[PDB]
Amino acid sequence: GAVKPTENIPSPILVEDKYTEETYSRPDVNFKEDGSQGNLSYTATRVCAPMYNHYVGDKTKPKLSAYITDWCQYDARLDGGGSKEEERGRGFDLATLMQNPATYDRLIFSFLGICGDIGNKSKKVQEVWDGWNAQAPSLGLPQIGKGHIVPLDPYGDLGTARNVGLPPESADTSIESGTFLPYYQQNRAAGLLGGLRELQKKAHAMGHKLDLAFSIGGWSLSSYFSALAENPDERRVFVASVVDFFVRFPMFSCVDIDWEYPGGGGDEGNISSDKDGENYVLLIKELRSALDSRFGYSNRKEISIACSGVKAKLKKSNIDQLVANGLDNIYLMSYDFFGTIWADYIGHHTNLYSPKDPGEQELFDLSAEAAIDYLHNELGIPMEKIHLGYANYGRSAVGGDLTTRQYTKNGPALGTMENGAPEFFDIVKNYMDAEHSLSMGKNGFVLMTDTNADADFLFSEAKGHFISLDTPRTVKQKGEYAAKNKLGGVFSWSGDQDCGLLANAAREGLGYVADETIDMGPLYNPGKEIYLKSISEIKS
């Protein structure tokens, strides 16, 4: 039967947020929900209610992991701000997960930085490094130097209470770069580290094991990995500071090294070298050794690394040798395959399947399965070590043409906080209706399904806005692929940008069954079917 949306909203997702709405109207914003005016919405996450369903545990199914960043808690609009860009924040409230504490099997605190960093957050890394070294004599602790991991935001990590699930009296505004060291341990922390401690306890109290991991690096904090990995003295400082973090915060059981990426192809200011892959093997070997001598094999710590979803990049990371030398998990960052400014053609940014005649798959027509197949078939990596990412955000383009796949590379593309990046809670608010028992576009957008790659996107014809995103259908599809192929799991990039719909779709694709907040079943429909030709097909 052809499906029509319901007139009624059986399961409300959207919630009124005065601050978001006020921001749209500001003269430096002029955001109209059909994307016809200002291109940035600055929407807060408060626009969506928590939509998490509760699924029955099942030890035989792949895991669901999520990143949570330390800066998503902020939104200065809650304090009367918002005239400045930086005062409009996401405001993700961890209390939403305290109320649904079994939602994820693992949460990955992100991101720590490294002394030595020379990228855009170098001043902050330096501030904290200096701060640490100022405090250490009085605490009987030694000086730290290049290679040592550090928090980026001592207040957000250890001092806040709002949006981190803690009582207001736990907030401590005296915590800053020059004072945080005594509070840098599990029984003292407030901030997001305190909230994660508390979330993990709430999960345990209702029968759920929530693993906690911490990630070092990520896109903006990767500039110095190449140098520390080359220098055995600095490798030794890095490794010991990893061990030290686990000692400070024993609630963590895994460290994720998010070096993006060995051999280059990360941010262009990163140090890189053709020795990166071989030096990473040395770093993992030494880490695996240090962790296992310190904690042993029963109360064991795992090691995870970021892996590019581009074959040409991940080859530079010697991942077979990493596994041979003690690596536990490979987090496949199979997203950002398309983005405005840099890509020559509009495309899917996080598609699992390759289109017909996808070519070299270096700059376009990429897919998660191409990377997985290379990892498994050419490098012999067991599927169980690989975790498949899904994106809780789109990559958009303006001026898009679905026939030629050309677009306005330098145009103002829709986004929440940055050009071209509409985050999933903002997409649910403005461009995709999931509230009337069907997944469809709204405000002039049409939900489409590309039958070539089998991936979904939103398109609005007037200005040619194209938004590539993960939808409940494609996240369910990724979950199915992970369960069928016995991957280690799927993970959410980033958990704080979902309202629960994609976590639900992931659980259902992975084969978990509800023990509902929202009936996901009618939301898994394809959109308008179109055949987006691969670049090779267009060019021939």
From Swiss-Prot:
Disruption phenotype: Cells with a disrupted yenA1-yenA2-chi2-yenB-yenC1-yenC2 locus are no longer pathogenic in C.zealandica larvae.
Keyword terms, alphabetized: Carbohydrate metabolism, Chitin degradation, Glycosidase, Hydrolase, Polysaccharide degradation, Secreted, Virulence
Main location: secreted
Subcellular location: Secreted
Domain GH18: 62-513
InterPro entries: Chitinase_II/V-like_cat, Chitinase_insertion_sf, Glyco_hydro18_cat, Glycoside_hydrolase_SF, Glycosyl_Hydrlase_18
Protein origin, superkingdom: Bacteria
pH dependence per the entry: Optimum pH is 5.0, in the intact toxin complex optimum pH is pH 4.0 to pH 8.0.
Catalytic activity: Random endo-hydrolysis of N-acetyl-beta-D-glucosaminide (1->4)-beta-linkages in chitin and chitodextrins
Active-site positions on this chain: 260
UniProt activity-regulation remark: Toxin complex is secreted when grown at 25 degrees Celsius or less; at higher temperatures the proteins are present intracellularly but not secreted.
Annotated EC: 3.2.1.14
Annotated GO biological process: chitin catabolic process; polysaccharide catabolic process
One annotated GO molecular function: chitin binding
UniProt: chitin binding residues: 186-187, 217-220, 261, 333-336, 493
GO cellular component, as recorded: extracellular region
Assembly behavior: Semipurified toxin complex consists of at least YenA1-YenA2-YenB-YenC1-YenC2-Chi1-Chi2. The Yen-TC:K9 subcomplex is about 26 nm tall and 22 nm in diameter with 5-fold symmetry and 5 copies of YenA1, YenA2, Chi1 and Chi2; the chitinase subunits may be solvent accessible on the exterior the complex. The Yen-TC:K9 subcomplex has no insecticidal activity. The native complex with additional YenB, YenC1 and YenC2 subunits is 16 nm taller and is insecticidal; the toxicity-conferring subunits are present at about 1 copy each.
Protein family membership: Belongs to the glycosyl hydrolase 18 family.
Main function: Part of an orally active toxin complex (TC) with strong insecticidal effects on larvae of the Coleoptera Costelytra zealandica, Acrossidius tasmania and Adoryphorus couloni and some Lepidoptera larvae. The TC has an endochitinase activity. This subunit might aid infection by degradation of the larval peritrophic membrane.
Name of the protein: Chitinase 2
Organism per entry: Yersinia entomophaga
